[PDB]
Amino acid sequence: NIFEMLRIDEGVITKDEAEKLFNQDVDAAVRGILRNAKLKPVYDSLDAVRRAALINMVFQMGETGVAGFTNSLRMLQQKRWDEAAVNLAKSRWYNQTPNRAKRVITTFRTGTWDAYMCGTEGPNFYVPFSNATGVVRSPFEYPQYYLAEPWQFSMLAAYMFLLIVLGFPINFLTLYVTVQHKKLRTPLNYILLNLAVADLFMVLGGFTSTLYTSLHGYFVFGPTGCNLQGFFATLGGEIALWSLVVLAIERYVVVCKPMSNFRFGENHAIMGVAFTWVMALACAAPPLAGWSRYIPEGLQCSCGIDYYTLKPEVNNESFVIYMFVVHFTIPMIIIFFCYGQLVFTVKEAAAQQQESATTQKAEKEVTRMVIIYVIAFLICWVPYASVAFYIFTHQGSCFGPIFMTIPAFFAKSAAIYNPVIYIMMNKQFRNCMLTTICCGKNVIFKKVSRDKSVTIYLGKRDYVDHVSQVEPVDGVVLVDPELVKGKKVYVTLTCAFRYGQEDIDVMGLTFRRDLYFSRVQVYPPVGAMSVLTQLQESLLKKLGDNTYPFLLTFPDYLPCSVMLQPAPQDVGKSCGVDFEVKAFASDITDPEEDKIPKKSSVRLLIRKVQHAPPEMGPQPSAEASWQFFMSDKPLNLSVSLSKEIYFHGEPIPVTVTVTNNTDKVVKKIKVSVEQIANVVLYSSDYYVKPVASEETQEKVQPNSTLTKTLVLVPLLANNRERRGIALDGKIKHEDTNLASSTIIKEGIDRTVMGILVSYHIKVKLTVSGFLTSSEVATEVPFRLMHPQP
Amino acid sequence: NIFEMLRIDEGLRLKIYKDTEGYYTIGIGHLLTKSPSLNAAKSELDKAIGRNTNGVITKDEAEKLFNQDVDAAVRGILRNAKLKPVYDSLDAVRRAALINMVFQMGETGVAGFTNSLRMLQQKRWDEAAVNLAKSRWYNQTPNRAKRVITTFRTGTWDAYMCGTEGPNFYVPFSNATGVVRSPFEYPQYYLAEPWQFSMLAAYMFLLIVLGFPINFLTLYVTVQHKKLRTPLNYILLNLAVADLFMVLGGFTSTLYTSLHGYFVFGPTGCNLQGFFATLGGEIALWSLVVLAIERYVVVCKPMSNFRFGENHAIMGVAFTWVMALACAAPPLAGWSRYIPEGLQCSCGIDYYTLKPEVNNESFVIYMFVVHFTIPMIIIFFCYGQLVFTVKEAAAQQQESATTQKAEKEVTRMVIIYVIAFLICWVPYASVAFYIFTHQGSCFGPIFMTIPAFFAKSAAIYNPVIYIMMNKQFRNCMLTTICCGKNVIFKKVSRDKSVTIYLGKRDYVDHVSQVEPVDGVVLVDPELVKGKKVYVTLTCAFRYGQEDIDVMGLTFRRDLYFSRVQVYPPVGAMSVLTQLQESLLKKLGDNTYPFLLTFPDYLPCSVMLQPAPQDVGKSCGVDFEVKAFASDITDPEEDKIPKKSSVRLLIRKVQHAPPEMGPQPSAEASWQFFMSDKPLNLSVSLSKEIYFHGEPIPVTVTVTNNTDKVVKKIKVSVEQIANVVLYSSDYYVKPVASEETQEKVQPNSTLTKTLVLVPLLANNRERRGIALDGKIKHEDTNLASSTIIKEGIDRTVMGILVSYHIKVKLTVSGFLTSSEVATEVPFRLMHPQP
């Protein structure tokens, strides 16, 4: 428009303030035009475009200068464009400023904004430089040294060289190391591996081609090569982007919800990598096939997406909006929500148990990484989005080649520093690459350590949990005086919640949560215990002189030993709670536990099992009635069981009694022993699943009653090869039974974390109504536990 | 002689007494002291006797005091010049008569007799007696003097004969007064008081009223009920017949005579009464001997239950009758005699009067020694070894409470059996022995009645202990006295309350672990309310008839028993099998599972084959799973309700193991008494484990280097039946046998292979053949070879079975034939299905 016209032509206050000073001159000049008797009729006759051209003349020369033009203003008023321009071209004004005048003179002839060219447009390219001097040539043919200094092309060659030397080894090593080591290949790392592949496409497809062209100073490969280079450069950047989005989603869902660790197998990881490739191709492909275009950007060396030149033939407006809104804002919102809720959950969880120092070290290291993840994301993509936005809002202004290079610097730098933060700073990949870079290197019972210095003793594995008080751990530890000299032996009780692989979760960001941990001294003691047990006395007399006792107690707010059943195809997936008694020697004071000298330590797992109590609860008898949308008649149902507490391998007779007073017919009566798997770690998440189920084919008629008793036998054998089934904690890969019903102590202070279990008989009536089938159902709770031996 | 003379005349007083003179005198006229003090008499008495007598001395001590007087008086006679030549002139008998005179009157009194002592020295007996009879001495004590005066005349002890002898009888009373008459003619009221004859009538009446019904009912009840008629009860029936002979033959006749007071029937009737009385008593005695022998052999050895048919029981009753007639008949035909005993009412054997015409000495010795010692030795040995066996057996498995109640009941009965036997026959034996040792002494009629009381009482109380206290006969007589009154499969009870379910009957026995019993039991809530249902595993050894064995003493032995509860259970079952889960889903809500396991020390299910004629004979091991309802707590297993209980038998069968043992190859050499050359024999089989119905090639190889010729070569598949219950008792038997007619020459070798086919069909109609346990009277096969686990703690009771190939060489030696033989073991079992 008029403001953009004079800004290009004519050339401390702000730019917006200068625009207002200009608008005052526009207002003042237009008044001056309408005042002069010679200028007013010409202004009224001419169109908005030629009016702005007249204002340009009135701006510089003034009303005085423009008023002197008799013949031209006559010919302009009479719609004679050529001879007006001829008279103008032969004047002092064209001689004074032939750059400015030639553009205005052509405007008077054409009557269109064709003359007003910022840069030099082309069929397959856009050079951000004026061809008024007559120096602009094709980027696909001749050198581009007129844009910027020749040494800056050597700088681009040196820069792209730096990206290849840093970029290729890091990403190639990431994949190479993964092929060697089995430890790394896990579904969560699949998305991190996709990030490595994405960055490799930026190196081979993008930077090496940009290097070759930067040396010559122009794009040698032509339009075809520019399309393919720009395609791989975009694809590499977009796959890298959406890889980080998927990684954020994964890390939020997998960490916060422990059940999802089982869920996320290889097929889900493939879907994440697939989605990454689909979203990348969704925005990378259209530039080739019409919607937008790949052209040489900046110095006309690197090819990229056209987000500056508004070409409605290829439709850049809608593409830049589509790109900006979706590919910028949505990842930002998703990633900030993901890691934001992640840190929110961890900070609240860390504050919940401040006694555990290990969680505080984790929470700190996570929050430090999340701040760096955000900084890396913003530094990468904000330059492109901000410049593209500023170019879109201010379209009339001109923009140089080096200005477009600044976003390209930070974005292509992300090809380097994203592997640093997401792969190199990752704890596992750091230790795995350390190995590769350095060429491969860098009755009563007991258990003996590996070094055979410390030897732990325990009376039993299965420790009982009574509702009021828990049965404590009791035992002794034999020590070698010669080996353990000037050292501290500690006996430790450990309760742990385990989810996922040990190497994969600990290394990524934060590790498995410990529900309760307890350290205790042994050799030498300050003296702890009041009086010793019969077990400790017997062991002291049996064993030699270097034997020392210990007594580790459980508090009242812990869960039982419970694991979850994996499928047979799930080879590398495990989640479950388990207790661990461990003893070790060390030089260091009390707080040095999390990290361990491996050789001296010895560990032996135990269980906090709950037997069924002597008092059986009240005989379960649920009852519920129903109505329907048309028929208002009642349908009374009453369920009743034999016992409140059933035992393992016991028949469960469900005496259902249904009295039908409604018009509808019932199709069938199905009973199901459904187990509620209530999983608790960070948040309360219930998970229902059926275990055993039996259904009768009998039908209840209108105004007819029925009394049937169906027996159900919930067993592990029939429920084998199923995901999510909670079992009692196994000792060492041996056969077990279905998980016991967890009992919680009445009116306790702290919340009970861990895997809680409860069973219930759920009868459901398939009622044959008016195509649609109404399924009414009711539940009644019961317990499945072991008997008292 | 002399001691018996003065004991009858002067009278033997044990305690200190004042004589006619009023001096302290003890024993047979043995003075103590002249002082009025009693302790002075005690002083000389205590010093003479040699202990604290306190006036009381034994009869034998009084005899020694008398012998001192005999010695002292004889010295006094020899001191006197008038008495010495008379003492020297007379014989031992008349010397004792003189000592009698010297005892009472003293040396002073006898010294005065001038004329008599002259005539006695001159061998003039009659006028001496006339002179002695005309003295103060005959006037003083004509009872005593008349006996001594007659002794001087005769020179025999006829005056001093205790009782009154006769042709057909012996009365234990003196005929010196002149009151004794024949027991076959006149009353005997002079012997004892008339009311004691009425007592005998009342006593014999009591024996008839108690004796006849008990023994007659025993036989009457047996004729009615089929259950009782069994070989073991045959000897108990013989006891009833024996006691009936004592009633009809003995007591009724004794009753008739006791009322009159003398034996009315004469010598002929006395012989017949005494014959039946002895016969009834002796058949009763030897019946108890046979009963003791039977009960020892039958109980301790389970195999003998089969053996004891009617013919062996008849031999026992026959032997009883033969031994009875062996001692009952001779009194009739000369050796001893039947005469009226005691009060001369009851007739019995003469064991008191020594009559060498009928030879009572040899008879009383023959009877006493044989009929007392042989039952005593046999019966005490029988019941002694029986209780010894049962007490040791009860201690072997104290876990079984049922055996402890039996062992207690047994020991209680055996003590009573001994007490009843001793109380019966000891009185007769002790009195007869005492009479034989002391023949010179007198014995009254009531003294002889005391043994007769206890022996005839045994006619009553033996039926009480042996028949009435017997468990079967007690329940059988109760009926008569009260007039006639007083794929998976399952089995339902009689009342149809409890219903047991089991997957299979044949449970397998592997050597290491036994396959356990698995199943469920359906229960009715309405019928079984406030009751306790138990499922029970029972392993049992059975021998003999079911009713008879409980009655004798103790019942069949259970090898192993284990009961288990069901409704309601302590909790539930830990983990269920596919069978229990399937049955629970098929059946309704009131179904409860059970799992009964076998230990490693039990045998297999094995029975023994009976003969076709053996209709009522059975012995064999079998397993029984039983379920029942009851009101009572756990230990009330011993008794069960017949209606609520339901039982289903099973087997602990052993299949042949997958890996066969080493190829059997036995070898043995032989020598002979004359020829010292070796005869090497070597046997070899195809397999260690043969199966049922498989050919058994016995490749015999005989290398003869001896001078003798072999007659033939016989091979035999022998079944060793090792039966163990109380003691280890092996029982060998052949099953299959084949023999070749070929002969091995001197210095010649032979290699032959004979095949043998052991089958049940060929071995039918044979006693003692062990078979695999039948389910329900169906066809089976020969018993499987039993396998025992290595190095177990407890001993394996039950019927163990094993097979071996026994080759025997009939060697034609120097008419006489030597039969050498060797064995090699093998197994006969079923294949793995």
Short mmCIF file of C-alpha atoms in Angstrom, two decimals, chain A residues 648-651 653 694 709 711 715 718, chain B residues 571-574 576 581 584-585 588-589:
data_model
loop_
_atom_site.label_atom_id
_atom_site.label_comp_id
_atom_site.label_asym_id
_atom_site.label_seq_id
_atom_site.Cartn_x
_atom_site.Cartn_y
_atom_site.Cartn_z
CA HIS A 648 -8.16 -70.41 47.37
CA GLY A 649 -9.47 -73.39 45.39
CA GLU A 650 -12.84 -73.21 47.15
CA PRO A 651 -16.21 -73.45 45.35
CA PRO A 653 -21.96 -70.87 45.30
CA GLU A 694 -20.42 -68.98 34.43
CA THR A 709 -27.40 -71.24 42.66
CA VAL A 711 -20.98 -72.34 41.50
CA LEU A 715 -8.21 -70.61 39.49
CA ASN A 718 -7.64 -71.36 33.71
CA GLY B 571 -11.19 -74.18 55.79
CA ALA B 572 -11.14 -75.92 52.50
CA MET B 573 -8.84 -78.12 50.31
CA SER B 574 -5.60 -76.33 49.36
CA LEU B 576 -8.08 -78.96 43.57
CA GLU B 581 -13.25 -79.01 39.68
CA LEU B 584 -18.06 -79.36 41.56
CA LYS B 585 -19.26 -77.70 38.34
CA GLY B 588 -24.83 -78.76 42.83
CA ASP B 589 -23.76 -76.52 45.72
#
